[PDB]
């Protein structure tokens, strides 16, 4: 059939900056069917406390969906997004670098 | 000017092994976009010209040079293989599931890229444009 | 100009239970009715502050009407599966949509696993079908001339009822958030690139051939967000610049760094 | 407002 490989950005709410609350974003997007995973990571460990939006489509008929959590950037620690999905042999993670 | 070879080979499959190699002080980098990982490697093996990833992911994909100033060497095109679902494979077809805008047949090493006329076209990978060093699953021999 | 649309989702899922059955209506690019059968008491509930006002009679219907909806997409997925002659154990998705714009044309197409199944042509009185398959549910939609029954809809009640949200929704419908733009520098030869920050709707335009361009993403507070980069020379920076297309602002902005 | 039915494919 027809599948679509998920597209993914990792991002803050707001601009980066040390010490100061924001929100992690993981958008998850242009994937074919809806089933998917995505886990937001902190250094590596899963973070338990996190929402996503409601599922919706395009007109191209390709899912999307957000991932956040509450977040406070550090100098030290690591965030990342994790998606599997029937299109990955193996889930796909995706480090947070504030300047993308 | 050095030469620039990745062991063992330059088309590698997610989660392996390689090492890129190049009298002292070599630099290595990654065309277009750099390649933090390269930042950390003790220099005692940057001194042997030994450059090598843990285990390759989709980050360390890319196009790499060396140099020691001398005249920066031939490129290596670095291949990750292993991300996507295998396809299926006289003329030769080779379909894939995933939407992919971009095929390659591969003479088993001896590799052949292509186009499809949809998503179609020894194994073969399938790809995306965008990331033409991301490839799928090798396709079943 | 002002839209409406509805979409619909029905994933079938084997062992798992029943297919899965969500809906949702837009204006524009708010969403302010979801249903969901997932949801512990499944009934179409508001997502937009205008329009939970609206008296008991009104979800009773938007309720009553969509759970019909869930029970037809359910008993289509077994309908197509039959027309494909697909396994019994294999997942599928069938997608609806339709939607009205200001009327200038309208529409309602159906797409199984990702392809265009059926679609309604402009002229509302006729269907374009995608395969085989998609025949047969042409010329019985033909046959049964469902088509006025959608053309009414599409010409008065989605039309009609548009017009009262766009006004209840005044402040949050007709208002455009600008982009907050910049550029940065990033070192490699050197890359550029441009930022279009915190803006609304979601269409808008930029350019710098080898540019990377990032789909636009919602910054999750309702606004949206979008880069573009590309690699120069270095002391080349200065022939580049950032073109900004979007409809809050009153004219493009041209940015360099 | 929905469109009070679906149709049947």
Same mark, same amino acid.
Request: proline share 7%.
């Given at each position: ?35 998917? +995973? ?6 590596? #460990?899963?973070?338990?406390? =996190?929402? *996503?939006?409601? @599922? !919706?489509?395009? %007109? ?9 959590? +509450? ?6 620690? #690591?965030?990342?997004?994790? =998606?599997? *999905?029937?299109? @990955? !042999?193996?889930? %796909? ?8 | ?141 | ?257 | ?9």
């Amino acid at each position: 059939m027809i599948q679509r490989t998920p597209k993914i950005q990792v991002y803050s709410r707001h601009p980066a900056e040390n010490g100061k609350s924001n929100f992690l974003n993981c958008y998850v997007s242009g994937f074919h069917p809806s089933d998917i +995973e995505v886990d937001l990571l902190k250094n590596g #460990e899963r973070i338990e406390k =996190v929402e *996503h939006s409601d @599922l !919706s489509f395009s %007109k191209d008929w390709s899912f999307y969906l957000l991932y956040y959590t +509450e977040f406070t950037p550090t100098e030290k620690d #690591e965030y990342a997004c994790r =998606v599997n *999905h029937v299109t @990955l !042999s193996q889930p %796909k993670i995706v480090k947070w670098d504030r300047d993308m | 000017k050095p030469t620039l070879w990745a062991e063992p080979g330059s088309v590698i499959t997610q989660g392996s092994p390689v090492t890129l190699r190049c009298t002292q002080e070599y630099r290595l980098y990654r065309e277009k976009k750099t390649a933090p990982w390269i930042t950390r490697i003790p220099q005692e093996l940057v001194k042997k010209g030994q450059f090598p990833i843990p285990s390759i992911t989709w980050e360390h994909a890319g196009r790499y040079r060396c140099y020691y100033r001398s005249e920066s060497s031939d490129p290596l095109e670095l291949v990750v293989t292993g991300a996507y679902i295998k396809p299926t494979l006289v003329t030769l077809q080779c379909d894939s599931q995933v939407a992919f805008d971009g095929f390659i047949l591969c003479k088993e090493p001896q590799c052949l890229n292509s186009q499809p006329h949809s998503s179609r076209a020894y194994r073969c990978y399938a790809y995306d444009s965008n990331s033409p060093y991301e490839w799928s699953l090798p396709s079943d021999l | 100009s002002h839209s409406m649309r509805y979409f619909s989702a029905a994933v079938s899922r084997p062992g798992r239970g029943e297919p899965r059955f969500i809906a949702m209506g837009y204006v524009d690019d708010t969403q302010f009715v979801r249903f969901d059968s997932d949801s512990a008491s499944p009934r179409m509930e508001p997502r937009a502050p205008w329009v939970e006002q609206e008296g008991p009679e009104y979800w009773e219907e938007e309720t009553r009407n969509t759970k019909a909806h869930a029970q037809t997409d359910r008993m289509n997925l077994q309908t197509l599966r039959g027309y494909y002659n697909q396994s019994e154990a294999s997942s599928h998705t069938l997608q609806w949509m339709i939607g009205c714009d200001l009327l200038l044309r309208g529409y309602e197409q159906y797409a199984y696993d990702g392809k265009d199944y059926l679609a309604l042509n402009e002229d509302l009185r006729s269907w374009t079908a995608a395969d085989t398959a998609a025949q047969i549910s042409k010329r019985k939609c033909e046959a049964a001339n469902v088509a006025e029954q959608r053309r009414a809809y599409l010409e008065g009640t989605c039309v009609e009822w548009l017009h009262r949200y766009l006004e209840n929704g005044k402040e949050m419908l007709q208002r455009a958030d600008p982009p907050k733009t910049h550029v940065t520098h990033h070192p490699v030869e050197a890359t550029l690139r441009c930022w279009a920050l915190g803006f609304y709707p979601a269409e808008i335009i930029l350019t710098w051939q080898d540019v990377e361009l990032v789909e636009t993403r919602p910054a999750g507070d309702g606004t949206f967000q979008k880069w573009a980069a590309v690699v120069v020379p270095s002391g080349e920076e200065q022939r580049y610049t950032c073109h900004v297309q979007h409809e809050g602002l009153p004219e493009p902005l041209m940015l360099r760094w | 407002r929905i469109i009070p039915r679906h149709l049947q494919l």
